[PDB]
Amino acid sequence: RFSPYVFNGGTILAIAGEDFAIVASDTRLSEGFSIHTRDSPKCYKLTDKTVIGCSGFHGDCLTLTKIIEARLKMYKHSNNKAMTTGAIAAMLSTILYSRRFFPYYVYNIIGGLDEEGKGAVYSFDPVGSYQRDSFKAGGSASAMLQPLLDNQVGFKNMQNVEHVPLSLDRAMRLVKDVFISAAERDVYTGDALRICIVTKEGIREETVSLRKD
Amino acid sequence: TTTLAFKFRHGVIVAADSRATAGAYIASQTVKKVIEINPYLLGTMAGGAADCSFWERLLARQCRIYELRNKERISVAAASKLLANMVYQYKGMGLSMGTMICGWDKRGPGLYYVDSEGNRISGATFSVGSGSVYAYGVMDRGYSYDLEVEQAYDLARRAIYQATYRDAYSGGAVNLYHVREDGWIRVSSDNVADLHEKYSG
Amino acid sequence: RSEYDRGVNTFSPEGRLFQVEYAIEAIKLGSTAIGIQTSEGVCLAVEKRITSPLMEPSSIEKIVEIDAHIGCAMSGLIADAKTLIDKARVETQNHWFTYNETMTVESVTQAVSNLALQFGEEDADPGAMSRPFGVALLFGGVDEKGPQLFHMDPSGTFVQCDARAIGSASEGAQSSLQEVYHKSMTLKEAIKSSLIILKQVMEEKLNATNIELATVQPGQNFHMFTKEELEEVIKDI
Amino acid sequence: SYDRAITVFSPDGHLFQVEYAQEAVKKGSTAVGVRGRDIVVLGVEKKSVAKLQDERTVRKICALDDNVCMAFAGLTADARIVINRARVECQSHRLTVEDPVTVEYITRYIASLKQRYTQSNGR
Amino acid sequence: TQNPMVTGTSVLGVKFEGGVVIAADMLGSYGSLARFRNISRIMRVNNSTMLGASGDYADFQYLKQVLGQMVIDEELLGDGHSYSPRAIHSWLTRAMYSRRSKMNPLWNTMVIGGYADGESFLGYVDMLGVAYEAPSLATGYGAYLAQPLLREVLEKQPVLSQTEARDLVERCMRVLYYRDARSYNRFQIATVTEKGVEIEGPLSTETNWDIAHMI
Amino acid sequence: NQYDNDVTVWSPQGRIHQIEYAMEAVKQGSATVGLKSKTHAVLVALKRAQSELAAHQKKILHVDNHIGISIAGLTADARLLCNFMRQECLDSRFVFDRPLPVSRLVSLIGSKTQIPTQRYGRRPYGVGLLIAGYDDMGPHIFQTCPSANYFDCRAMSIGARSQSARTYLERHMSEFMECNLNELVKHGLRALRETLPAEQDLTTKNVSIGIVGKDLEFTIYDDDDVSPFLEGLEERPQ
Amino acid sequence: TTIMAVQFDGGVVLGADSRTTTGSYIANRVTDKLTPIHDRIFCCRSGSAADTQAVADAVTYQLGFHSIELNEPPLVHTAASLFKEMCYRYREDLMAGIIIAGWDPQEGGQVYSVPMGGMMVRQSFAIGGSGSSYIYGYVDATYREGMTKEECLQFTANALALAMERDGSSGGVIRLAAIAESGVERQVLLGDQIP
Amino acid sequence: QIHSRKMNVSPDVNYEELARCTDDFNGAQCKAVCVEAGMIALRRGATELTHEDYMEGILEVQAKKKANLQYYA
Amino acid sequence: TGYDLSASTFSPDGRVFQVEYAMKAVENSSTAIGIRCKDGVVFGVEKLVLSKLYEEGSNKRLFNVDRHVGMAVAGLLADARSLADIAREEASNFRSNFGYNIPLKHLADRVAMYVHAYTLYSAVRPFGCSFMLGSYSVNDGAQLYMIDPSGVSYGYWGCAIGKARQAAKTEIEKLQMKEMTCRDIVKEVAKIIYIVHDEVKDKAFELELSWVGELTNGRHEIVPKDIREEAEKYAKESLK
């Protein structure tokens, strides 16, 4: 029979520092055991201060990304202002919930500077369940990446250690290292790392190579 | 996960754990399972996270319109009836939510239990969730209508902490909320690990 | 007029739309409401014009709360104002529900105007609003931009006004407002100015029962029902 | 402008057909009401006994719910329709919200039913 | 289409400097039987775009009718605006996603190749609505039996001249013929270039059966 | 005239009065001027104020990055029409992932306006527009009428006191294609100044300037944003 | 059950068996599978008796209105397109495979095969039904370009006869129709062409 | 134009546009638009009559009168 | 007359005035002339430039109904653009269901039915535009039809719609349309338009020329630029 969903793979990560938000994703579209493409970056920049990462069935990821963009324009005409990162998170929860009985198989992490200018990460379940978080990783390799951020950005399980604030330089290094290790043990993760840094000046994209096996 | 609500002489005490789990994996340990519907109304949530968050938010919106239109804050019984009616329409469609709507109104301290199955009941003490069974035992042994306010908080903190120890899907900091005539107050949020040293000794 | 006023459907040989102008006339039957927007906040003042001693003062609602940050004053048909006021109250809450944020005063005025515009769309809820609404609403609120006051009219047209008057004696009030209003006016200075203008343009003496006052400022919430301070401010002036 | 048409306005600004409806209320028998500290009371007049006519059927004062009662002045049949609709809403309010209808709500409901007839022609 | 009836097999696409080449067997198979042996699975949409389809032919014939009517309709307007290859890819993705949501899918995997404004476009549209733009593309069994040859050559040399790319496609088509049961030795090759879309006629590939002698 | 009652009734003189009356509604609105260079299209409008304390009314609206509109005639119809334009543009960016051709939008705006003209029950739309946009084939300025007729115009002015602007445009139409953006704007406001009564003059508050270009998304400049274009203006001719 | 069409230069020869079967019972041993859609267009139907009878009657009604409306003899390509549109639209609902073969002045004798999907292909020879699988070799072996009507009539009778013998579903009588500018000549072969 | 020949009309004035505006006008009314336009320019002290002054004459002749009405701006 | 107001109401004599009032607006429109040469049909429209601000090609009165079929419209353009859309849809559905390009005779009958329907109902005014449809097919040859605002359609070897329909038809009769080659016919169409232009009354005008035929391979393309320029030169010399 027709099966409405397929797992196209992919992993997304967002780390939010005081003045920066880093949304990074692997760039492999994978169907079954075959690789559909080695360059399909998940990160999509919805607004100057907001980047969303969508991993799961690609058709669902593509449709949601178009719906979010159409709705950001609809709001800009209506309110004469851009949706703020928290508002984009709230709107996403409602859209995901509308298809509660036919779920969008998309894991979404929204990362951007907030109205104060502090980095904010909102993590969503497939039917919409956002919680503001300092760090979150979602996708096929979500389980492998999340614990390291807890150990180092979180400083969890650590005694007699200074809780120094995360620096943008250190954060980029953690983003690459979690992904480089993830490619080693995840069949669905590898190829390239697209990293987006949301800063007051604006989003910047950096690509780091990962194992192509 | 684990939510407990009891109405003692000095107001109603609502406390909940902070854990959300996707299957075995813990999605988060910082979840907020109490929704502040109004300054005098708090609704706790258990069961599917998405279903509870949207439906309680919908009640919160429905109540603010009722406050603006009728010029009087909604009753706890009306609030429970509204949530129960909305959930009943979607019955057999897989909605999963268990909630307690608690507030101080004209009638008095009020605590209500609303279920996705359509069960709306009122009671002095209720615990809803995976760790509800554990919370009920410790709360039931040691619940007094005449409990002192500081003592009532300690029974609530312990009941969630003991429930977290037995329940795998129950864990995280315990959020303590006091609903009184003046209005709700967030007494404190304490991580189970810190409580484990103090309570165990 | 001279015919062509039978429906908003018909157009005048001059090209004017009658019926829309007739609804603009209905606002004049309303009691005067004066709103002044200042950096400290927006002040709304109204003439209650209580018909009888027996009737309860609260039932006449000339100033109503759309939301904590937004307050509205209505001059014109009472029933028509209620339909528009309900839409603004549902919309502010729906914008909160969908976007987890407080709607701007301009956006509420725009949303209400959209229903007001449908005098005869012929597609929306057929059998509803076959005629233009007869109420002019002054929306005073503090939003992210700051204190803002917006005037909507029966034709769906809305504008931001530093100071505005609606209802009977609106024309007299506006002329007085241009002389009194200045950019640096404090909310307190504006509140005194609004009642002074209201006293001159109302036949009855400005006793506390006669005038209802409202003020929205960034620090506080709606606070638009000054109570017993209606007596205090009036006596000082 | 024109008196005949509920929706046509007037150059002065008046929906005359609505005002013509108020005349029927004035021609109705007098009814009075007072608000008492514990005994709200409504009074009615013109029993107007007609000799061979039973007066149980004439019911100018009709209760809507246990906590709320109403007295109508105007066309008798139109009143019967409004009273019944208000009676249904009072019970429905209890089904939608398990709390008795506040008096303001039933008056707002009666006002809304009355406004809906005013809004369009054909009613 | 809940159940596919007559289905085409793999379609191969490789971009080349100045254009794209798409190759598809002229066969329609009802299960094992190759019922139709002279069927074109490549369509010309406009003068800068071409489409190759795998899967139920009846669904492709319908898509060909709908896509063609859209091009004729834009031509009637004649306002100097014509759909780009990327725009055809988007419409196919939206149509395929909408069909999936209705639970009545179009059973086809499609490759859209075009050269517009100096840029080649190669795109894949799945029945589910998965869509990506890639340097090389293969559908059905071909992604397993052809894209590996294409990827190695394309990675080693990023830009392939038209002759080299046409040679690669013929080489892969032979590999599909030998190892795909649904394949037929009567492929057709379409090339999009600034000159336009040209669909070559029945072609066949020389086959070496020498391995048979050595057990 | 008993033949003037409805848009569904033909005059015995072969005219439809209701449609012509709707065009008169456009005249009552303030003047709006649009001119196009080879690379940029600019719409400049005069904003009237209902009350001195009240802010000036919006005259220019943003349909999309590629399209912008100027309003003349009923504000009520303009908001209804602008909403149709915004929906059509966003749908094009969704269904086809291409900025909608401005010419194709104008045809769609025209098709909707004809249905009120041909059938009873809705007033013929009473708003005239000056669409300005950059598409694949270059800058386009289009004007629309309640009659459902759309005209591609190198430069046009619709509204009260428009003829003075159209005459300046007729004399200056040839130099418009090669002029730079600052010159194209200076010409456009100069056309608007002719519409103004002699006592009134262009001010940052009363003028709205909207520019859509090959390198510029449609941008509305108002208040201080209008000031660079306003400054350096030729002194008003006396 | 077994249906076949061959296109000679001046026309088409269409033939089929006469068996309608429920399980292993023959409901009709003498079935006219070939039906006249129009004066010079015929369709041979295979699959479900009810579905085929309905779509054929529906097309006959639509084509008849089109021909009177346009005052011209109907082209075979339109007749095939009407059958194809119905089959594709109601693919899940209908279980019918049709061979639309007819003579049209504009394009001459032509044979169109609509498989159950609703796909349409113009074929020099098309064979359909349960028996078709059995005679696929003879059809692609004994077909020679430019066969005369008499040769095509012999080919159809022989190919259908070979399939009828192998297929239990197909059997009985062979119904043969030749369509040309002159018109249609219908012959019934009482199981001839025995090999 | 025939009546305005004596008056100092500006070259800018376009008679065709004015004629299109003056639908259903008798010839005497067309003369009236010209006569009134001359007085309207005299009221503002204008040396020459602009097209807009002629448009004002059309309104005065029709007795229509003009003002901003809102629901328009 | 009182009875003139409704399209649904017949006059006492037995005619509908509303249908007649539509035709008079068609008469007020600028003339469009179409001549059926043996190799296809050539259409020319006396489009009138107004203001001069409008860019060339604005308010075109020649439209493509289908690749083969072409239409020339005289009357309110807005009504014509609607009719063109109705015809484009009918052609779309015909290729869509019947599978072959629409026969011009059938497309004309269908568009005429849409125009006819408007006449019988009070809610909708009858269409105020008259149009002619021309196409070339190998099977049917060149075909030309004209549909009036009352939805009446009949074949014409040559026809003109607009203010100068009578004047142009007299000039059209002189041409040997039955055997004339289309390339020569285009030049004649330019001359016929130039004779009926009444340029002093109409001020400026732009000639629009449309061609469908064996030369065009059954495509209703606008006559290529320069071919029109020669026709304009031939007409200008003939005028003087």
Ligand SMILES: CC(C)C[C@@H](C=O)NC(=O)[C@H](CC(C)C)NC(=O)[C@H](CC(C)C)NC(=O)OCc1ccccc1
């Ligand atoms: C916020 C609280 C109400 C959540 C709380 C209640 O028990 N704890 C939980 O663990 C809940 C309940 C679960 C065991 C069914 N967990 C969940 O709801 C988890 C993860 C959350 C972060 C969204 N979600 C989940 O398992 O699947 C939900 C779903 C349902 C339909 C489609 C797609 C996804």
Ligand SMILES: CC(C)C[C@@H](C=O)NC(=O)[C@H](CC(C)C)NC(=O)[C@H](CC(C)C)NC(=O)OCc1ccccc1
């Ligand atoms: C068009 C016919 C002349 C072809 C005929 C061949 O024997 N086909 C059939 O007869 C098909 C069998 C087929 C599915 C193999 N069977 C039938 O049509 C018979 C009815 C008999 C009284 C004739 N059964 C039937 O229609 O009911 C069950 C059914 C319903 C729908 C589809 C297929 C089968």
